[PDB]
């Protein structure tokens, strides 16, 4: 992918919003870039609920690294569109604008696709209750005295 850093994500979000793009005649503003990066970091943190939320592969910057911009985001190729569309939607009110219907719909679609695989992975069935017999058909277990499921 040619979008490889938080700066590329922020530039894509700003281009989608129309704030700063080559389609217009505006360049990305250095002070806006830092605030957009902060918003992106906050949104990734809010999504990824310390491992119990949306898993994306995003790498969180530390205090030691001087520039928040410039680090590879670490996202897979299939999450970039969702991430930067949601970023554009979130940082639109900073400029007293409003993201358009296409941007909002793409953000919703991207978030749903982002959580699809994790939802499939978490769709797991609970084990048998500990009060269920194994049935006399299970000859091995019944001979080995496993007359009930272990459960838990």
């Amino acid at each position: 992918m040619q979008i490889k850093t938080k700066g590329d994500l922020v530039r894509a979000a700003l281009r989608k919003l129309g704030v700063a793009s080559d389609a217009t005649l505006t360049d990305v503003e250095p002070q806006s870039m830092q605030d957009a990066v902060d918003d992106l970091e906050a949104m990734m943190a809010e999504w990824y609920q310390d491992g119990k939320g949306i898993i994306t592969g995003y790498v969180f910057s530390d205090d030691e690294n001087p520039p928040a911009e410039g680090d590879d985001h670490g996202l897979r190729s299939s999450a970039v569109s969702a991430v930067f569309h949601n970023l554009a939607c979130r940082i639109a009110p900073d400029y007293a604008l409003e993201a358009t219907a296409k941007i909002i719909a793409t953000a919703k679609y991207g978030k749903e696709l982002l959580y699809k695989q994790t939802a499939i992975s978490r769709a797991k069935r609970a084990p048998y209750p500990s009060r269920m017999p194994t049935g006399s058909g299970n000859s091995f277990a019944n001979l080995n005295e496993w007359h009930y499921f272990p459960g838990e």
Binding site: F140, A141, N144, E145, P150
Partner: protein
Amino acid sequence: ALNEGQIVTLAVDEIIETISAITPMAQKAKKYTPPAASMQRSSNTIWMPVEQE
């Protein structure tokens, strides 16, 4: 003499026993049977208690 008969090769099936070993340790060792439930080879670990103190 010069009796040019037909020659055959005779193989006899009375074997020559050569090996006779003994296993005095495995006979003393106790043969346990683990109360396994599932027939899976994935790390067959069976936990057993120890005498209390």
